[PDB]
Amino acid sequence: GSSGSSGGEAIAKFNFNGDTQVEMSFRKGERITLLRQVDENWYEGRIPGTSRQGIFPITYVDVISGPSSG
Numbered sequence: 001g002s003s004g005s006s007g008g009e010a011i012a013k014f015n016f017n018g019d020t021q022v023e024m025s026f027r028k029g030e031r032i033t034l035l036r037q038v039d040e041n042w043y044e045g046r047i048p049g050t051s052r053q054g055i056f057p058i059t060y061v062d063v064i065s066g067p068s069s070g
Helices: none
Strands: 010-012 033-039 042-047 052-056 061-063
Touching: 033 052, 042 061
Parallel strands: none
Antiparallel strands: 010 061, 033 042, 042 052
């Protein structure tokens, strides 16, 4: 184990089109391996197969590990 840390799982509610390397693009449905939260309205994570890394808004991705909602 190189790096040991907990995160969570999320689902891209929509498609993201990043322009800068810092930002990361994901396809609707793709699994975003949550790594860490950059800002209050920006979650960080990578994508399987593309081993990409960057930032992205919340509204875009819907995390499962959270509060209760109907």
